[PDB]
Amino acid sequence: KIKALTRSITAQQAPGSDVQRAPRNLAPELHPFERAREYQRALNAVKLERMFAKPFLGQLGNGHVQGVYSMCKDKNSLNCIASGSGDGVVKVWDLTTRDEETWRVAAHNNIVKGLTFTNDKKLLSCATDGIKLWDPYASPSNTTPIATWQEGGPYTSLSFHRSANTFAASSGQGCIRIWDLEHSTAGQAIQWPSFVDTITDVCFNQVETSVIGSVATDRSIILFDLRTNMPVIKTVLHFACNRIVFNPMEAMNLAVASEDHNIYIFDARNFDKALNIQKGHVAAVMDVEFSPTGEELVSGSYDRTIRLWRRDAGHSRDVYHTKRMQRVFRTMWTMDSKYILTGSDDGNVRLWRANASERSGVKATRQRQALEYNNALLDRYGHLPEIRRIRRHRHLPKVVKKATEIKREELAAIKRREENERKHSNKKYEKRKSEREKAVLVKQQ
Amino acid sequence: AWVADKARFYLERAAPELREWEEKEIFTKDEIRNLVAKRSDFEHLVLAPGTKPTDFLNYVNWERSLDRLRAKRCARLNIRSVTSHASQARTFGIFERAVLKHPGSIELWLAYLEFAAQVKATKRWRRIMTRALRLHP
Amino acid sequence: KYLATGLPHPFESQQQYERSLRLPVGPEWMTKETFQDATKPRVIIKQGIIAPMSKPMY
Amino acid sequence: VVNFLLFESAVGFSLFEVVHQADTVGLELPEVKDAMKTLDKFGKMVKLRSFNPWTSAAQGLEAINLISEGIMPEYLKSALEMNLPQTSGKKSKVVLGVADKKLAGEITAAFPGVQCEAADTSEVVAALLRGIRTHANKLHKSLQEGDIGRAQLGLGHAYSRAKVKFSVHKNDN
Amino acid sequence: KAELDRIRRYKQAQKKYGRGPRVDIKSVRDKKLRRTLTNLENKYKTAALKAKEAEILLENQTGFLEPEGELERTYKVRQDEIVKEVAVEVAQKKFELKLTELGPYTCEYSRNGRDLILAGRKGHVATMDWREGKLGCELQLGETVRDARFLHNNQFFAVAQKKYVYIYDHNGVEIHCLRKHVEVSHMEFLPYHFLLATLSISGQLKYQDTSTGQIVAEIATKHGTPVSLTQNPYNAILHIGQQNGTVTLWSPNSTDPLVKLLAHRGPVRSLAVDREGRYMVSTGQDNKMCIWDIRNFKEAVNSYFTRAPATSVAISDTGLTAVGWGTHTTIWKGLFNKERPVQVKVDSPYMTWGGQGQVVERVRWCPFEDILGIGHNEGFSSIIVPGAGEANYDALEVNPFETKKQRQEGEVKALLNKLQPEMIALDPNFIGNLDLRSEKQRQAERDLNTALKKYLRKQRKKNIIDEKRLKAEELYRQM
RNA sequence: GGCUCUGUGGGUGCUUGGCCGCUGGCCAGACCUACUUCAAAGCCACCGGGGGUACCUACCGGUUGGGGAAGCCCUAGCGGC
RNA sequence: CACGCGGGUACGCUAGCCGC
């Protein structure tokens, strides 16, 4: 009963067709060096993403004259940005045509501290002058405001409601005050009962409406319930916090960018300990912003750096820097959650991208499958030594590198002093307090 | 043309029904090799660049005749466990990528409506009828 | 240099991690359906306004 | 964010349904421009939803002499009634993309639930209709009876002659 | 019950495609780790199950022959009977080249079996596409030829001349000669690394990276001239076989041999090793051949005897082996089954090629067809044997009908995934395992009467006094 | 009838058979897988010239921790040098 | 919850009672 294996070339091409038939056998005897070949592909993927990591995309227009000290997106639209500079001129940009501004006005005298968009089409801006309202999208251009507000002390920041026409302005008298447009004139001033220090930032929670967070120069965060108009809880941290922000997918999580060079991710129900502590900076953190997918963070720092973070990381995914970028004051995502914008002290609004090596547009299937395969392979073999050193290597400027070496030396010295005092003092018979628990000094109601 | 990598999915989807038919005594192993070769030739003809509505209809007719043959053989061998749902699902898949590729062919639209009406799919028939009326008003 | 110097963060045991990787991801060793299901990303971002969530889903 | 888009050509008007819409921040990027060039990476964006051809060259002539003047025709209103989901804009709208601003205003005034984006104002729908005008021969070829070249030729001649009144005072041949 | 077939299917798929025991989810103490590892165990289980279910779409069938009657036996089957009973597209491949005047010939196929190279001893090196019958190259070279070998494609080949090795292009135009490799008697090309490993007559083993062109590691095998050389296709370690009668396992990351399997009393004459890396059959100068389990490093069965010191042995893609001794080769079928834990001896050979006065120099299997090429002193002779050859190839790894565009793309992908030569060990899946010493040191820097006499015997010789020894002296005084 | 080209056989060295697991067999082949006591002595082993030497390798000398062939002795032992 | 083949109440049809 003789029979041998006969292979026609019909098994490679059927006659009359251009389709090269590719028969596949998945038996492991045919495919040797599985783990080794996958390690080599992961190493190639790391070197490829370090080669095609090109994050700078552009710059919005000619920029400002003095530095960009406030900027705000439109959370309803997708290409409406505005930025107010230090000489008190605001500009409304359209992200589709970045060649020139859409609407500019010499708004105030001093710097523009806060700025926001209304939910209809209009925008608001703070100063030490007092807050103003403009209509940047009108068939004649109008430089003059259509409402202004001076009573209520020196205002510092704005935050608009998600749905209604309500907005809260953080003032310098220790209160925030809440206006509803079209039927309120002076607004309602909510404050902690005996509070003096200025409230620096204010942020409506976009998920849970009528919950307002604020930071203040008492190194404290304070909450506010708008439904019963009173403050709620106040916790004093160790260092001053520059900016509060909330998570757009999880209603209870917040992040404070603080002068401790640090980002603290807190739970609003239990202010006992920080949920996460992102520590990567060199100078103070000026601005933090969650991604609209709620899983990443941008922080613009007071040195020349933007740091991109995952939500559970605790260390930098990316760092962005430039010799032309002078300081960084305001960083925020676009609503794509793909590109980030950076308002600097050079007067420039720059448009970077998150996922620096991932190009946009429509990909073919064998293109995006290669990219997803490389990302899954790096998720598996990213902790091996060669792959680790090439994926962590990033070129930092000399001042930032020297100062983070100095910061590592000082932190190691402080840890050694604390460990020696623990080993030779009476604190030896105690449990070590965790660092997330050490992040909060006191909490009070 | 990534047609080999494209048809790999449809063959790997049709595989476990062939495993059930081999573990029952309904189709023998040489007949299942013939079914594999015929479905492979049909998929590599269907997902080709230069294709035709008559090619899509030949594949539809072959899959539907395979379902009818397995129904006759299952009733003859007295099995009730084997169902026709996977064959109807893959025939609907053939027809959906058929009307994706050639939407301007009323012969293929009417064959799709005849198939969806014949295997008792009234709501699906109404949706197919709405798409056909939108393309050929 | 191809061995791993320490355990990765979530893993608690050498047997756990060295037995949890265990299977190649690539298309040579796994089927097409398995390769797609194993290299789907965790967060799938489509284009558009990613607005914050209005009402509770669950 | 676009949902559907109109596209009028000399053989008729067809409305496409966008899936995997275009990135609006990286519109001036070279990779996205190459995606708009290649048909294999723009047909992933557009999928042909409906097609309405003319009945005759007289209807095509009436179609241009209404559309260029701005006013929408009754059969365009008919095909939009047929293809768009019937809504009024109180809790859910449909974004349509059209090439002309006056036609946008009229479609929005005829259907209150359809918000129209003009290609003269919006760069996203401008680039998207530009890609459809680029690949318009291949997106329609499964139901393109004949060609588009002779249709555009005869229709441009009929439109120009109706605008000029050519035959009533050209007689010397 | 009806689910017994389901449990048998899962046991079979966990055996074959599982590549490991399983993760014990019950011992995991962390909750998020427990649910993510349960998710991973579900995904790996359905992975192995879907691969086993998609092993039905294999096209071809494995060839065979089985004796019908009780008197008929498989080794008495003539090649004329095979050629009469078999199909014509595979009966075409049973040819014979009659090249008499230019030495005993040496056959080597390319690793898809498209082109074969045959080299005479006195110089005649030719490269042909043996199915399509055209020759790509033929050249005469003058001096002697030790071994000819294809490289990664059928484009480049490499010939071992009287002093150096030379690598040549597809037309036979000599690209270059390798001067570091002097008196090379044996060569083996690792396919996945791009290394070409040459044993000289002096016993020096040089690994030259073919892609970049620098010799990676010159190992000097300290004992004797080597008699034979083969290459494990699963580990890419080199089984060389010495003259005192041991085979030694070599790797470019060590100057000592990895193991040394003690073998036949005389020199080992030839080696062969399975493509799954399971077993190795060796034939010695003492007339025995014997097989070894490689994954456990022990002898599987008793020594078979060959009736002459076997010049070559080469085992197929399935279980067949051709052991070519003297002037006629014999093919054995069931020497090492993978499934059996304890192997049994085969009584009779599978089939025998005839002894008609042509001394066999080298037998090789065509890697994907069911034939066998014997290179002997009268030339080349291809015989057809039905049971051999892997019936179902994978078009991504290696393709018997590879077009020009597919060959170019595959060569570039193999260049991109060439493996560094430090990724060679006895177990090739170690990449990602624990450095146990480094993990113990990491956990240490995170959490921070019979031997104590030989301790002092070892530390009285330094003569550093070293206060731990003072404590040990006080302890010894108390004892 | 002639030139040219090609093919086969013999010759171009002094005549002792075709094959094999060869003191015997076979040319129609036959039988098929046994039998086993003790791995191995050392040395040599061809790359063009001048130069560099971080890393790898070779050679030489060491260092920590283990390991104990062998040599020596005896209070005899789970011994000791 | 139902999805195959028969005889039924009933067909230019398949809705309903029991089986194979």
From TrEMBL, chain A:
Pfam family, one: Sof1
Localization per record: Nucleus, Nucleolus
Domain Sof1-like protein: 354-440
Name listed for the protein in its UniProt record: DDB1- and CUL4-associated factor 13
Main location: nucleus
SUPFAM superfamilies linked to this entry: WD40 repeat-like
WD repeats, residue ranges: 61-97, 278-309, 321-362
Family statement drawn from the similarity comment of this UniProt entry: Belongs to the WD repeat DCAF13/WDSOF1 family.
Region Disordered: start-end pairs: 416-445
SMART domains in alphabetical order: WD40
Cellular component terms per the entry's GO annotation: small-subunit processome
PROSITE patterns on file: WD_REPEATS_1, WD_REPEATS_2, WD_REPEATS_REGION
Keywords: Nucleus, Repeat, Ribonucleoprotein, WD repeat
Keyword Kinase appears in the UniProt entry: no
InterPro entries: Sof1, WD40/YVTN_repeat-like_dom_sf, WD40_PAC1, WD40_repeat_CS, WD40_repeat_dom_sf, WD40_rpt, WD_repeat_DCAF13/WDSOF1
GO terms, biological process: maturation of SSU-rRNA from tricistronic rRNA transcript (SSU-rRNA, 5.8S rRNA, LSU-rRNA); protein ubiquitination
Highest taxon, organism lineage: Eukaryota
Biased segments, Basic and acidic residues type: 432-445
UniProt key word Transmembrane helix: no
TrEMBL record, chain B:
Domain of life: Eukaryota
Main localization, broad class: nucleus
Any one GO molecular-function label of the UniProt entry: snoRNA binding
GO BP terms in the entry: maturation of SSU-rRNA from tricistronic rRNA transcript (SSU-rRNA, 5.8S rRNA, LSU-rRNA); mRNA processing; RNA splicing
Keyword Iron: no
Coiled coil regions, renumbered to chain: none
Domain U3 small nucleolar RNA-associated protein 6 N-terminal: 11-84
Family (UniProt): Belongs to the UTP6 family. Belongs to the crooked-neck family.
Protein name: U3 snoRNP protein
Automatic annotation (TrEMBL), chain D:
Compartments reported by the entry: Nucleus, Nucleolus
Stretch forming the signal peptide: 1-21
Family, as annotated: Belongs to the NOP5/NOP56 family.
Name the record gives this protein: Nucleolar protein 56
Full-sequence range covered: 3 to 175 of 523
Automatic annotation (TrEMBL), chain E:
Compartments, as annotated in UniProt: Nucleus, Nucleolus
Domain of life: Eukaryota
SUPFAM superfamilies: WD40 repeat-like
Keyword Hydrolase included in the entry's annotation: no
SMART domains xrefs: BING4CT (SM01033), WD40 (SM00320)
Keyword DNA damage among record annotations: no
Annotated keywords: Nucleus, Repeat, rRNA processing, WD repeat
WD repeats: 261-302
Cellular-component GO terms for this entry: 90S preribosome; small-subunit processome
Domain called BING4 C-terminal: residue spans: 349-428
Purpose of the protein: Involved in nucleolar processing of pre-18S ribosomal RNA.
Alphabetized PANTHER family for the sequence: WD REPEAT-CONTAINING PROTEIN 46, WD-REPEAT PROTEIN BING4
Protein name: U three protein 7
Species name: Chaetomium thermophilum (strain DSM 1495 / CBS 144.50 / IMI 039719) (Thermochaetoides thermophila)
